[PDB]
Amino acid sequence: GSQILCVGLVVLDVISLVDKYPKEDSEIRCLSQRWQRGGNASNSCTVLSLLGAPCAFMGSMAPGHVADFLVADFRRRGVDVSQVAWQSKGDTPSSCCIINNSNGNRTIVLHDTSLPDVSATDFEKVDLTQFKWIHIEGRNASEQVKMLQRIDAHNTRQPPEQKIRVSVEVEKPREELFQLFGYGDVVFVSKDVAKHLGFQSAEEALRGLYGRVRKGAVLVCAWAEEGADALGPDGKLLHSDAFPPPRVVDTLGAGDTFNASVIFSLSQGRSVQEALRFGCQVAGKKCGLQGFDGIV
Amino acid sequence: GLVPRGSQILCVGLVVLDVISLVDKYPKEDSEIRCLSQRWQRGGNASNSCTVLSLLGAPCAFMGSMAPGHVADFLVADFRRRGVDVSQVAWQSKGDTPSSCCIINNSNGNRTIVLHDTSLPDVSATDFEKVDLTQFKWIHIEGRNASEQVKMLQRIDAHNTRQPPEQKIRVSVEVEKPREELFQLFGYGDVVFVSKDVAKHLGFQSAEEALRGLYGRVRKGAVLVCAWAEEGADALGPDGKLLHSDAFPPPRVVDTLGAGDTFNASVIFSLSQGRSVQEALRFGCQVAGKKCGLQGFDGIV
Numbered sequence A: 001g002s003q004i005l006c007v008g009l010v011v012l013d014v015i016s017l018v019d020k021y022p023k024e025d026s027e028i029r030c031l032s033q034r035w036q037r038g039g040n041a042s043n044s045c046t047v048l049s050l051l052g053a054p055c056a057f058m059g060s061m062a063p064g065h066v067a068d069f070l071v072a073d074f075r076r077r078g079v080d081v082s083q084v085a086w087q088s089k090g091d092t093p094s095s096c097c098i099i100n101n102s103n104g105n106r107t108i109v110l111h112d113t114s115l116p117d118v119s120a121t122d123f124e125k126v127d128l129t130q131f132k133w134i135h136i137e138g139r140n141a142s143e144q145v146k147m148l149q150r151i152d153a154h155n156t157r158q159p160p161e162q163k164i165r166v167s168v169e170v171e172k173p174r175e176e177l178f179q180l181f182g183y184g185d186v187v188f189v190s191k192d193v194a195k196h197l198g199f200q201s202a203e204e205a206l207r208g209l210y211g212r213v214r215k216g217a218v219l220v221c222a223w224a225e226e227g228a229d230a231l232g233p234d235g236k237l238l239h240s241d242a243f244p245p246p247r248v249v250d251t252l253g254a255g256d257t258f259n260a261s262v263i264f265s266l267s268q269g270r271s272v273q274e275a276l277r278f279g280c281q282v283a284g285k286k287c288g289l290q291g292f293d294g295i296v
Numbered sequence B: 001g002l003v004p005r006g007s008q009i010l011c012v013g014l015v016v017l018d019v020i021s022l023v024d025k026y027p028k029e030d031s032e033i034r035c036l037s038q039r040w041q042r043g044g045n046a047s048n049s050c051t052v053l054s055l056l057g058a059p060c061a062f063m064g065s066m067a068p069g070h071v072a073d074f075l076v077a078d079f080r081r082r083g084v085d086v087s088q089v090a091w092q093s094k095g096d097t098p099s100s101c102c103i104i105n106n107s108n109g110n111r112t113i114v115l116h117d118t119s120l121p122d123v124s125a126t127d128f129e130k131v132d133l134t135q136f137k138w139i140h141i142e143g144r145n146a147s148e149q150v151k152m153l154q155r156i157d158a159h160n161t162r163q164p165p166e167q168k169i170r171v172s173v174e175v176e177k178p179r180e181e182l183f184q185l186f187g188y189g190d191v192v193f194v195s196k197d198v199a200k201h202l203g204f205q206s207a208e209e210a211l212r213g214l215y216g217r218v219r220k221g222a223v224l225v226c227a228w229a230e231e232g233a234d235a236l237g238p239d240g241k242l243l244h245s246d247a248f249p250p251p252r253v254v255d256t257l258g259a260g261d262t263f264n265a266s267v268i269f270s271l272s273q274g275r276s277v278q279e280a281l282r283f284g285c286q287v288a289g290k291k292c293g294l295q296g297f298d299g300i301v
């Protein structure tokens, strides 16, 4: 149990860096362009790798020239791809990302290619003994709940010192995913999900959604410039102010930087308060740079 | 491989990777949306004309700037898919292979474009100097970096001076963008294509007005051509006779993107086949009109 595993998506981010967001029906030239390996679980593996944590990525990929770019990027970062669910049907998903250089805002137009998702069958083949931590990016909820029931069953047959710590991410405001609330030691709920459920702050969301988490779980909600908050079994609300850079240039994957940094800090035995703080610290650092290089 | 002497039609200009996404609604800044469909296409004027020439049955070559990388790889495989000779590409050690993001709102049909960056250098006169011209029977230049292209055109003129009339390379130029620097290109080539957009920005309200008002800018013996979409196209040569062909509209209009490039390549093809200017005008109108009722370039011939 020496590695952190992230189960989720790997998407090709085709990036255009603009000085201002284009008005509808307008024609504006971009400042610069780059291809970036994206996908939430995939971005968190980049961050975990830079933090010095051995990690593995599990997600669906389709053989082609794009997957060769993605795989070469994963390998250059030392991310283990041995668990990848290579598919025969479907193309590798790609997205057009417009990054506003003046405020760091990122607009994503995702092309979801109907690539078959990672299944409980794919997960059943995985050797759970090499993993210290397993993070699951909420996608195919019913099929992931089965992956989560499999980790819990393994845990019950293991000593407390050899148990696999589990984290879940509920980013999209999709009702199917609200069952995952639900499972795991740490539950990351997005600001978008929280707002969609009628909450105007991180503290409100935590108080209103805690009843949905597993006994003894920590519910975490980041709220951009408002920093981030956490709530555990003790009922004590924990807050961390954000660490915004003086110039916010790229927020693409900031939330993924936060999740990965919180997971790394907890996996290192640090307190929830310290982990919240470290999450905001690394995410804030990322926001003042293009991509993920130089975050540490 | 071995290209026979005076066998190819060369087009010099832009190649860009256009990523086109169809959306339910225009995305609001800082949001993550899912497009209805996404297409990766090879674009650019000279690039589109190259595809059309291959489909017409002509050996053709593309000359343009690319930087090694994944974008270039996609573009090279798309050129090769269309039988385009890619050996004259000006590879660049600095800059980005052009890529554009187009967003189409499915509801109103509006097109929002994030254009490629200006980082990649255009083909230069020194890059063009290194080209052995003997395998080309026709060279078409898309007006971009005018001062450098003027020298490319002077080089061809020099080459032609030393050749018997049967081994002279025919030349065409396209002034498509309403940019002042491009207007000096009107004085070069045997055939000059002027866009409706340029004509309008110069105050002309019809293809007849544009040709009459701009013919003085062309070199002796040149033919000035202007397509005006639904109004068809005109041509004017040294005899002073305004030639015209009506448009050949398709039953339903599907995709007009690259219709001007289809017209250009078809007029060039027809002229290179020894057909008259009137026959070339008609042929260009027919092929471009058929293209408009088709998605992309499949089945234009």
Ligand SMILES: Cc1cc(C)c(C#N)c(N2CCOCC2)n1
Binding pocket: A222, A223, A224, A225, A227, A228, A242, A243, A244, A245, A248, A251, A254, A255, A258, A279, A280, A283, A284, A287
């Ligand atoms: C979108 C967004 C914008 C900014 C300015 C920050 C920062 N700093 C940020 N993070 C806050 C901490 O939690 C992770 C995200 N996210």
Ligand SMILES: Cc1cc(C)c(C#N)c(N2CCOCC2)n1
Binding pocket: B227, B228, B229, B230, B232, B233, B247, B248, B249, B250, B253, B256, B259, B260, B263, B284, B285, B288, B289, B292
């Ligand atoms: C944009 C545009 C729209 C339409 C409907 C046509 C036609 N027909 C057309 N072409 C006319 C011939 O010359 C080339 C262009 N172009």
